Write a protein that binds this ligand. Structure first.
Ligand SMILES: O=P(O)(O)OC[C@H]1O[C@H](OP(=O)(O)OP(=O)(O)O)[C@H](O)[C@@H]1O
Ligand SMILES: O=P(O)(O)OC[C@H]1O[C@H](OP(=O)(O)OP(=O)(O)O)[C@H](O)[C@@H]1O
Ligand SMILES: [Mg+2]
Ligand SMILES: [Mg+2]
Lengths: 178, 178
């Protein structure tokens, strides 16, 4: 797919970042090349419409890199975007959920009125690694009695088995690296 | 202006967050209402085209809330978006710039290869308060020899004199509160 190639060729892979042996997949060049960004958003939107039809009510974008994609994806689908943030950032009543990040723990948070019970959401982030971040997002959304139809990302690091961590919630990525 | 009203009516104010006496202007409902989000992006894009014609090379979006607007604004203008991040997040050689956040210090960071000398940039963030964050972004861009044509936000807190802090760099906000 030439569209997918426009995204793939704009992923920059940095070895030994942040630690030796780990390859960092930098999406910055996708953002910097408007054709690449448009392609990525288009491919995600097409997948989501083909898979869910009119079922999606909202996109949820994950703080922080997921914010780069959530609003554009929502816009392309004619939907709003709700936010899931690192804890401490959002005003008003919230729920929060811990997850494991590198060597310690972190928490995500959502405003209690972000969604109503029964609303259907797709979560977007830039990259799925261990699945911890996305899993915390799904937990929060479930606690608002929202239905998570799918999680999606531009990049998936398949050797880390994030897909399995999210099951039974469906997952889709544009690009896969071991 | 009904377009501007679509944005204004989706700002939610929270007293005493995160500290007593201040009012947090929550842009979440702008993101959640696709018409509101489209209006905000459109108003910013129209202003920028009206003020700079075709001279803008890139949008720079600021981590984290600014990420919600940078790519969409860039896309509307047919431009790429470059990233300025909280320090520690970007791979490759970087520059960083400290600024005063609440009671302590934070740092923004940019990849050394993010822009070439002479390239023309408009910085976008959700909110201008003291101007510390935006000012740090301008410092980083200037240290890459980029030309900052303008900084823009959805919300400006005028009593904090952020505009003055940025001068002589032009600034534009959609909405103003004390
Ligand atoms: O699948 P996981 O193992 O949880 O890792 C994936 C997450 O890691 C990165 O975010 P990071 O926490 O580095 O924060 P950022 O958004 O501030 O870059 C990335 O943007 C994902 O959100
Ligand atoms: O003009 P200033 O006084 O610098 O304040 C404005 C900045 O403050 C907020 O960011 P915050 O640091 O709260 O981080 P966030 O983007 O993670 O919410 C806001 O999104 C601006 O970036
Ligand atoms: Mg992240
Ligand atoms: Mg910010």
């Amino acid at each position: 797919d030439s569209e997918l190639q426009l995204v793939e060729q704009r992923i920059r892979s940095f070895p030994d970042f942040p630690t030796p042996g780990v390859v960092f997949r930098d999406i910055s060049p996708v953002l910097k090349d408007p054709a690449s960004f448009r392609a990525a958003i288009g491919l995600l939107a097409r997948h989501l419409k083909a898979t869910h039809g009119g079922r999606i009510d909202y996109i949820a974008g994950l703080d922080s890199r997921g914010f780069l994609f959530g609003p554009s994806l929502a816009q392309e689908l004619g939907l709003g975007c709700v936010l899931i943030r690192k804890r401490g950032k959002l005003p008003g009543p919230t729920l929060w959920a811990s997850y494991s990040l590198e060597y310690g723990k972190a928490e995500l948070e959502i405003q209690k009125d972000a969604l109503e019970p029964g609303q259907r959401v797709v979560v977007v982030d830039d990259l799925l690694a261990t699945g911890g971040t996305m899993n915390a997002a799904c937990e929060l959304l479930g606690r608002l009695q929202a239905e998570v139809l799918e999680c999606v990302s531009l990049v998936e690091l398949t050797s880390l088995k994030g897909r399995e961590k999210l099951a039974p919630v469906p997952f889709f990525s544009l690009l896969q690296y071991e």
